[PDB]
Design a protein around this ligand. Structure first.
Ligand SMILES: *[C@@H]1O[C@H](CO)[C@@H](O)[C@H](O)[C@H]1NC(C)=O
Length: 318
Protein backbone atom coordinates (compact mmCIF):
# COMPACT_ATOMS: atom_id res chain seq x y z
CA UNK A 1 0.00 0.00 0.00
CA UNK A 2 2.70 2.70 0.91
CA UNK A 3 4.96 3.26 -2.07
CA UNK A 4 8.40 1.84 -1.35
CA UNK A 5 11.35 3.80 0.05
CA UNK A 6 13.59 5.14 -2.68
CA UNK A 7 17.24 4.10 -2.05
CA UNK A 8 18.84 7.27 -3.46
CA UNK A 9 16.73 9.29 -1.00
CA UNK A 10 17.35 7.15 2.08
CA UNK A 11 21.14 7.24 2.07
CA UNK A 12 22.99 9.21 4.80
CA UNK A 13 25.60 11.63 3.45
CA UNK A 14 29.08 9.86 3.45
CA UNK A 15 31.05 12.43 5.46
CA UNK A 16 29.64 15.42 7.28
CA UNK A 17 31.53 18.27 8.93
CA UNK A 18 31.36 17.94 12.77
CA UNK A 19 29.12 20.54 14.41
CA UNK A 20 30.10 22.11 17.68
CA UNK A 21 27.31 22.42 20.29
CA UNK A 22 25.35 25.54 19.37
CA UNK A 23 23.94 26.11 22.94
CA UNK A 24 27.25 25.73 24.85
CA UNK A 25 28.50 29.34 24.40
CA UNK A 26 25.26 30.76 25.86
CA UNK A 27 25.05 28.12 28.63
CA UNK A 28 28.52 29.27 29.77
CA UNK A 29 28.05 33.07 29.26
CA UNK A 30 24.55 33.46 30.63
CA UNK A 31 23.28 32.82 34.13
CA UNK A 32 22.80 31.80 36.81
CA UNK A 33 19.00 31.60 36.58
CA UNK A 34 17.05 33.14 39.42
CA UNK A 35 16.76 30.66 42.33
CA UNK A 36 12.94 30.29 42.16
CA UNK A 37 12.86 29.59 38.33
CA UNK A 38 11.74 25.98 37.46
CA UNK A 39 13.73 24.04 34.84
CA UNK A 40 13.28 21.16 32.42
CA UNK A 41 16.48 19.60 31.14
CA UNK A 42 18.31 22.64 32.54
CA UNK A 43 16.25 25.07 30.46
CA UNK A 44 13.98 27.53 32.33
CA UNK A 45 10.23 26.84 32.21
CA UNK A 46 9.42 30.27 33.61
CA UNK A 47 12.26 32.81 33.28
CA UNK A 48 10.62 36.20 32.66
CA UNK A 49 13.53 38.13 31.18
CA UNK A 50 16.39 37.85 28.72
CA UNK A 51 19.85 37.25 30.18
CA UNK A 52 22.36 40.18 30.55
CA UNK A 53 27.10 31.61 7.46
CA UNK A 54 25.08 34.80 8.23
CA UNK A 55 22.17 36.65 9.88
CA UNK A 56 19.49 38.80 8.14
CA UNK A 57 16.10 40.35 8.80
CA UNK A 58 13.04 38.62 7.27
CA UNK A 59 11.05 40.77 4.85
CA UNK A 60 7.36 41.63 5.19
CA UNK A 61 6.39 38.97 2.61
CA UNK A 62 8.46 36.32 4.49
CA UNK A 63 6.78 37.26 7.79
CA UNK A 64 3.34 37.11 6.07
CA UNK A 65 4.14 33.59 4.86
CA UNK A 66 5.38 32.37 8.26
CA UNK A 67 2.23 33.88 9.79
CA UNK A 68 -0.04 31.98 7.39
CA UNK A 69 1.46 28.61 8.30
CA UNK A 70 1.28 29.54 11.99
CA UNK A 71 -2.44 30.16 11.46
CA UNK A 72 -2.92 26.68 9.96
CA UNK A 73 -0.98 25.14 12.87
CA UNK A 74 -2.99 27.10 15.40
CA UNK A 75 -6.42 26.27 13.89
CA UNK A 76 -5.56 22.53 14.09
CA UNK A 77 -6.01 22.74 17.89
CA UNK A 78 -9.69 23.62 17.32
CA UNK A 79 -11.96 20.54 17.54
CA UNK A 80 -14.30 22.15 14.92
CA UNK A 81 -11.30 21.73 12.57
CA UNK A 82 -9.99 18.33 13.77
CA UNK A 83 -12.09 16.15 13.92
CA UNK A 84 -14.95 18.43 12.92
CA UNK A 85 -13.56 19.10 9.40
CA UNK A 86 -15.04 22.61 9.30
CA UNK A 87 -13.56 26.12 9.15
CA UNK A 88 -15.51 27.33 12.18
CA UNK A 89 -13.00 28.83 14.48
CA UNK A 90 -11.67 32.33 15.37
CA UNK A 91 -8.68 32.50 12.99
CA UNK A 92 -10.44 30.24 10.41
CA UNK A 93 -11.31 33.23 8.06
CA UNK A 94 -7.71 33.09 6.61
CA UNK A 95 -8.11 29.40 5.61
CA UNK A 96 -11.90 29.19 4.87
CA UNK A 97 -11.48 28.64 1.06
CA UNK A 98 -9.36 25.57 1.55
CA UNK A 99 -11.06 22.21 0.86
CA UNK A 100 -10.60 19.84 3.82
CA UNK A 101 -9.84 16.44 2.28
CA UNK A 102 -9.51 14.27 5.46
CA UNK A 103 -8.66 14.51 9.16
CA UNK A 104 -7.39 11.96 11.68
CA UNK A 105 -7.36 11.58 15.47
CA UNK A 106 -5.30 8.42 16.16
CA UNK A 107 -6.03 6.00 18.99
CA UNK A 108 -2.77 5.42 21.02
CA UNK A 109 -0.60 8.53 20.36
CA UNK A 110 -3.57 10.97 19.83
CA UNK A 111 -2.07 12.28 16.55
CA UNK A 112 -4.41 14.92 15.11
CA UNK A 113 -3.71 15.81 11.47
CA UNK A 114 -5.41 17.05 8.36
CA UNK A 115 -4.95 17.31 4.58
CA UNK A 116 -6.45 20.35 2.81
CA UNK A 117 -6.17 21.90 -0.71
CA UNK A 118 -6.16 25.51 -1.89
CA UNK A 119 -6.96 25.75 -5.63
CA UNK A 120 -6.21 29.52 -5.87
CA UNK A 121 -2.74 29.10 -4.42
CA UNK A 122 -2.19 25.65 -6.01
CA UNK A 123 -1.16 24.10 -2.70
CA UNK A 124 -1.81 20.75 -0.95
CA UNK A 125 -1.50 21.38 2.80
CA UNK A 126 -0.66 18.92 5.59
CA UNK A 127 -1.12 20.14 9.15
CA UNK A 128 -0.20 18.40 12.40
CA UNK A 129 -1.53 19.51 15.80
CA UNK A 130 0.72 19.42 18.89
CA UNK A 131 -0.31 18.03 22.26
CA UNK A 132 -3.77 18.71 23.70
CA UNK A 133 -2.05 19.23 27.11
CA UNK A 134 1.08 21.24 26.26
CA UNK A 135 2.36 22.11 29.71
CA UNK A 136 2.13 18.42 30.77
CA UNK A 137 3.72 17.38 27.46
CA UNK A 138 6.70 19.63 28.11
CA UNK A 139 7.00 18.59 31.78
CA UNK A 140 6.74 14.85 30.89
CA UNK A 141 9.09 14.82 27.84
CA UNK A 142 11.67 12.05 27.75
CA UNK A 143 14.54 11.64 25.38
CA UNK A 144 14.68 8.10 24.03
CA UNK A 145 16.92 7.97 20.94
CA UNK A 146 16.16 5.08 18.59
CA UNK A 147 17.19 4.02 15.08
CA UNK A 148 15.42 6.07 12.40
CA UNK A 149 14.43 3.09 10.25
CA UNK A 150 14.43 4.66 6.78
CA UNK A 151 18.05 5.96 7.04
CA UNK A 152 20.69 3.68 8.49
CA UNK A 153 23.25 5.46 10.79
CA UNK A 154 20.67 8.00 12.08
CA UNK A 155 18.54 8.32 15.27
CA UNK A 156 15.41 10.14 16.33
CA UNK A 157 13.42 10.50 19.53
CA UNK A 158 11.08 7.47 19.84
CA UNK A 159 7.94 9.47 20.91
CA UNK A 160 8.14 11.62 17.76
CA UNK A 161 8.64 8.65 15.51
CA UNK A 162 5.65 6.93 17.18
CA UNK A 163 3.39 9.99 16.77
CA UNK A 164 3.95 9.93 13.01
CA UNK A 165 3.86 6.18 12.47
CA UNK A 166 0.29 5.77 13.71
CA UNK A 167 -1.19 8.21 11.07
CA UNK A 168 1.44 7.58 8.32
CA UNK A 169 -0.14 4.96 6.09
CA UNK A 170 -3.49 6.61 5.61
CA UNK A 171 -2.17 10.11 5.46
CA UNK A 172 0.46 9.35 2.80
CA UNK A 173 -2.21 7.60 0.65
CA UNK A 174 -4.47 10.73 0.92
CA UNK A 175 -1.62 13.14 0.10
CA UNK A 176 -0.37 11.17 -2.90
CA UNK A 177 -3.95 10.81 -4.24
CA UNK A 178 -4.21 14.62 -4.16
CA UNK A 179 -0.78 14.97 -5.78
CA UNK A 180 -1.82 12.58 -8.65
CA UNK A 181 -4.91 14.73 -9.26
CA UNK A 182 -3.08 18.12 -8.97
CA UNK A 183 0.41 17.38 -10.23
CA UNK A 184 1.61 21.07 -10.50
CA UNK A 185 0.57 21.92 -6.92
CA UNK A 186 3.07 22.63 -4.09
CA UNK A 187 2.95 20.31 -1.05
CA UNK A 188 3.35 22.30 2.16
CA UNK A 189 3.67 20.67 5.62
CA UNK A 190 3.24 22.58 8.91
CA UNK A 191 2.92 22.09 12.62
CA UNK A 192 3.54 23.64 16.06
CA UNK A 193 5.15 22.01 19.04
CA UNK A 194 4.95 18.23 18.84
CA UNK A 195 3.14 18.81 15.54
CA UNK A 196 6.28 20.33 14.15
CA UNK A 197 8.22 17.15 14.91
CA UNK A 198 5.51 15.10 13.24
CA UNK A 199 5.55 17.51 10.28
CA UNK A 200 9.25 17.03 9.77
CA UNK A 201 9.00 13.23 9.78
CA UNK A 202 5.99 13.49 7.35
CA UNK A 203 7.96 15.73 4.87
CA UNK A 204 10.90 13.29 4.93
CA UNK A 205 8.61 10.29 4.37
CA UNK A 206 6.94 11.94 1.34
CA UNK A 207 10.35 12.76 -0.18
CA UNK A 208 11.53 9.20 0.47
CA UNK A 209 8.44 7.57 -1.17
CA UNK A 210 7.38 9.85 -4.06
CA UNK A 211 9.91 10.62 -6.86
CA UNK A 212 7.71 13.49 -8.07
CA UNK A 213 8.33 15.50 -4.87
CA UNK A 214 11.59 17.36 -4.36
CA UNK A 215 13.00 20.73 -3.25
CA UNK A 216 10.97 22.33 -6.11
CA UNK A 217 7.56 21.36 -4.74
CA UNK A 218 7.80 20.07 -1.12
CA UNK A 219 8.08 22.68 1.66
CA UNK A 220 8.22 22.43 5.49
CA UNK A 221 7.24 25.14 8.03
CA UNK A 222 7.33 24.55 11.79
CA UNK A 223 6.72 26.69 14.89
CA UNK A 224 8.11 25.94 18.34
CA UNK A 225 9.47 22.62 17.16
CA UNK A 226 11.63 20.44 19.48
CA UNK A 227 14.83 18.86 18.29
CA UNK A 228 13.94 15.53 16.58
CA UNK A 229 17.17 13.58 16.10
CA UNK A 230 20.96 13.34 16.28
CA UNK A 231 23.61 15.12 14.19
CA UNK A 232 23.62 12.34 11.54
CA UNK A 233 19.80 12.70 11.26
CA UNK A 234 20.12 16.53 10.92
CA UNK A 235 22.78 16.16 8.22
CA UNK A 236 20.43 13.71 6.40
CA UNK A 237 17.59 16.29 6.58
CA UNK A 238 19.91 18.97 5.05
CA UNK A 239 20.89 16.54 2.28
CA UNK A 240 17.27 16.21 1.09
CA UNK A 241 17.31 19.90 0.07
CA UNK A 242 13.68 20.31 1.28
CA UNK A 243 13.00 24.02 1.90
CA UNK A 244 12.64 24.25 5.67
CA UNK A 245 11.72 27.31 7.68
CA UNK A 246 11.86 26.66 11.43
CA UNK A 247 10.26 29.55 13.41
CA UNK A 248 11.12 30.23 17.05
CA UNK A 249 9.32 32.83 19.19
CA UNK A 250 11.65 34.79 21.46
CA UNK A 251 12.57 32.64 24.51
CA UNK A 252 10.32 29.60 23.69
CA UNK A 253 11.79 26.61 25.64
CA UNK A 254 10.56 23.89 23.19
CA UNK A 255 13.13 24.54 20.39
CA UNK A 256 15.81 23.96 23.07
CA UNK A 257 14.53 20.54 24.02
CA UNK A 258 16.15 18.04 24.28
CA UNK A 259 19.23 20.25 24.82
CA UNK A 260 21.94 20.07 22.11
CA UNK A 261 24.39 18.84 24.76
CA UNK A 262 22.26 15.64 25.08
CA UNK A 263 23.23 14.74 21.44
CA UNK A 264 20.39 16.17 19.39
CA UNK A 265 20.68 18.79 16.62
CA UNK A 266 18.30 20.87 14.46
CA UNK A 267 18.20 21.13 10.74
CA UNK A 268 16.15 23.82 9.02
CA UNK A 269 16.97 27.54 8.79
CA UNK A 270 15.98 29.39 11.99
CA UNK A 271 13.50 32.28 11.80
CA UNK A 272 13.72 33.86 15.26
CA UNK A 273 10.96 36.24 16.25
CA UNK A 274 12.78 38.87 18.41
CA UNK A 275 10.04 41.51 18.89
CA UNK A 276 6.29 41.89 18.21
CA UNK A 277 6.24 45.71 18.32
CA UNK A 278 7.35 46.11 15.52
CA UNK A 279 7.39 42.48 14.34
CA UNK A 280 11.00 41.55 13.73
CA UNK A 281 12.35 38.14 12.60
CA UNK A 282 16.12 37.44 12.66
CA UNK A 283 17.07 34.70 10.18
CA UNK A 284 20.18 32.64 10.85
CA UNK A 285 21.07 31.66 7.25
CA UNK A 286 22.50 28.24 7.91
CA UNK A 287 20.78 24.85 7.38
CA UNK A 288 22.25 23.45 10.67
CA UNK A 289 21.46 25.43 13.81
CA UNK A 290 23.86 28.10 15.08
CA UNK A 291 24.76 29.93 18.29
CA UNK A 292 23.59 33.26 16.77
CA UNK A 293 19.77 33.23 17.06
CA UNK A 294 17.59 31.71 19.88
CA UNK A 295 20.45 29.49 21.08
CA UNK A 296 22.08 32.76 22.28
CA UNK A 297 19.51 33.14 25.13
CA UNK A 298 19.61 29.74 26.83
CA UNK A 299 18.88 28.78 29.57
CA UNK A 300 16.60 31.90 30.06
CA UNK A 301 13.65 30.20 28.29
CA UNK A 302 9.87 30.27 28.74
CA UNK A 303 6.79 28.09 28.29
CA UNK A 304 4.68 31.30 27.81
CA UNK A 305 6.71 32.22 24.66
CA UNK A 306 5.69 28.80 23.19
CA UNK A 307 1.99 29.64 23.39
CA UNK A 308 1.81 32.48 20.91
CA UNK A 309 3.48 33.12 17.55
CA UNK A 310 2.90 36.38 15.62
CA UNK A 311 0.19 37.31 18.17
CA UNK A 312 -1.73 34.12 17.36
CA UNK A 313 -2.46 31.73 20.27
CA UNK A 314 -0.67 28.44 19.44
CA UNK A 315 -1.81 25.49 21.55
CA UNK A 316 -5.09 27.01 22.64
CA UNK A 317 -8.07 27.51 20.25
CA UNK A 318 -8.77 31.13 21.24
C1 LIG B 1 8.40 29.77 38.49
O1 LIG B 1 7.66 28.61 38.97
C2 LIG B 1 7.90 28.43 40.38
C3 LIG B 1 7.05 27.21 40.68
O2 LIG B 1 5.72 27.50 40.31
C4 LIG B 1 7.59 29.67 41.27
O3 LIG B 1 7.89 29.24 42.67
C5 LIG B 1 8.40 30.87 40.69
O4 LIG B 1 8.12 32.16 41.30
C6 LIG B 1 8.18 31.12 39.20
N1 LIG B 1 9.12 32.13 38.73
C7 LIG B 1 8.84 33.07 37.77
C8 LIG B 1 9.94 34.13 37.54
O5 LIG B 1 7.75 33.04 37.15
Amino acid sequence: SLPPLIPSRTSAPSSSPSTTDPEAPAMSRNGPLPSDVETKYGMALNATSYPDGGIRAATSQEINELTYYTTLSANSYCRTVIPGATWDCIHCDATEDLKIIKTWSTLIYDTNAMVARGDSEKTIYIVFRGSSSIRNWIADLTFVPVSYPPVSGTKVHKGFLDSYGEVQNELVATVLDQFKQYPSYKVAVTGHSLGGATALLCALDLYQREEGLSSSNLFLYTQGQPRVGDPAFANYVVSTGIPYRRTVNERDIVPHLPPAAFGFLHAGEEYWITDNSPETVQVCTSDLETSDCSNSIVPFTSVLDHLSYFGINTGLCT
